[PDB]
Paper text:
The assembly of [name] into amyloid filaments is associated with more than twenty neurodegenerative diseases, collectively termed tauopathies. Here, we describe twelve phosphomimetic, serine/threonine to aspartate, mutations in [name], which we termed [name], that collectively induce the *in vitro* assembly of full-length [name] into filaments with the same structure as that of paired helical filaments extracted from the brains of individuals with Alzheimer’s disease. The [name] sequence ([Fig fig1]) comprises an amino-terminal projection domain (residues 1-150), a proline-rich region (residues 151-243), four microtubule-binding repeats (R1-R4; residues 244-368) and a carboxy-terminal domain (residues 369-441). The [name] folds of AD and CTE comprise residues from R3 and R4 and the carboxy-terminal domain.
[name] and [name] versions of [name] [name] were expressed in *E. coli* and purified, followed by *in vitro* assembly under shaking conditions (**[Fig fig1]**; **[Fig figs1]**; **Methods**). Assembly was carried out with 500 rpm orbital shaking (2 min on; 1 min off) for 7 days at a protein concentration of 100 µM in a buffer containing 100 mM potassium phosphate at pH 7.2, 400 mM potassium citrate and 4 mM tris(2-carboxyethyl) phosphine (TCEP). Because [name] filaments from AD brains contain equimolar amounts of 3R and 4R [name], we also assembled a 1:1 mixture of [name]-[name] and [name]-[name] [name] under the same conditions. Again, we observed predominantly PHFs (59%), with a minority of singlets with the Alzheimer [name] fold (11%). The PHFs were identical to those found in AD brains, with a backbone root mean square deviation (r.m.s.d.) of 1.4 Å (**[Fig fig1]**). We then used a biosensor cell line that overexpresses hemagglutinin (HA-)tagged tau297-391 in HEK293T cells (see **Methods**) and compared its seeding response to increasing amounts of PHFs made with tau297-391, [name] [name] or [name] [name]:[name] (**[Fig fig5]**). Comparing the recombinant PHFs of tau297-391 and [name] [name] or [name] [name]:[name] [name], we observed efficient seeding at low concentrations (∼5 ng) of [name] PHFs, whereas tau297-391 did not lead to seeding at the same concentrations.
Author numbering:
A (entry chain C), B (entry chain E), C (entry chain F), D (entry chain A), E (entry chain D), F (entry chain B): 307 to 378
Amino acid sequence: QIVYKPVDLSKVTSKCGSLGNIHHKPGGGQVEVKSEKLDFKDRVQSKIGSLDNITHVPGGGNKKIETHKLTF
Amino acid sequence: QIVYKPVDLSKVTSKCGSLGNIHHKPGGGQVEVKSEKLDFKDRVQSKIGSLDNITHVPGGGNKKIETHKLTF
Amino acid sequence: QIVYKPVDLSKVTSKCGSLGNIHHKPGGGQVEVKSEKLDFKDRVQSKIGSLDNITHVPGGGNKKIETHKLTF
Amino acid sequence: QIVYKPVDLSKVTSKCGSLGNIHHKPGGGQVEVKSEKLDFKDRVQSKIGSLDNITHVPGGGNKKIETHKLTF
Amino acid sequence: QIVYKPVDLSKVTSKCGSLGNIHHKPGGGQVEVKSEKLDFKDRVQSKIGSLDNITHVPGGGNKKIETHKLTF
Amino acid sequence: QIVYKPVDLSKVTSKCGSLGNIHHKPGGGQVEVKSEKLDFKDRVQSKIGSLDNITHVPGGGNKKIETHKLTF
């Protein structure tokens, strides 16, 4: 007899009184790339020649990850 | 007998009193890429020659990921 | 006997008192790409030569991902 | 007797065998100015808040400046 | 008796066999200026808050400046 | 008796066999200025808050300056 019975009662929580006055001001820039050949196969993930800017301000932004497995 | 019975009662939660006054102001830039040949196969993911800008301000933005598996 | 009976009663939740006063103002830029040959096959995902701007302000923006699997 | 008799027989000269293959490619940018009061009077020359690009390719472009003065 | 008789037979000269293959490629940038009051009078020359680009390729570009003066 | 009689027979000269393969590639940058009051009078020349780029390639680019004066 096999019984699998994990119990989860957890909390991930935040409080923030006021969130703001955020300034993001990058001063440009320059990028150059040279190549002759590219050859990509099974599950390649790639990024060539970027100049990318991100502002990310979540009011919460909490994460939880679970993985429940049984196997014979 | 096999019984698979995980129980989840978890919480992911947030409170934010006021969210704002966010400024995102990038000053341009320059990108150059050279190649002769590209050849991409099974599940390739690619980005060549970008100048990309993102502002992301979710009021919550909480994440939960689950995976429940049984296998014989 | 095989019983598969996961129970989920979990919550992903947010409150935000006021959301706004967000400014996104990029200053242009320049992008150049050269190649002679391309060949893309099974499940290729690609982006060549971009200058892309995104503003994303959801009032919630919460995410939940599930996967329930059984196999013999 | 007063005699004013300058003699000018001078030359300003050029030769250029071939002219070209010139590239001018700026990557944008960002400019901000704040003030409350302006007051400009006699022979003021002014420029507030600029993002200006110039390409200038004259085949000659030679200059000669003269000033001849007499006074009693 | 007053005689003013300067003589000019001078040369300003150039030869250039071929002029070219010139690249000017700046990567953007950012400028900010604050003030409350400006007050400009006799013969003021001014520039506030610039991001300016110049390419100048004259085939000759030679200069001569003269000033001939008499005064009593 | 007053005689003023300078003689100029001078040469300013250049030869250049081939002029080129010139690259000018600045990488952006950031400038900030704060002030309360400015007050400019007789023959002020001024520059506040610049991010300026110049490429200057004359095929000749020779200069001569003269000044001939008599005074009583």
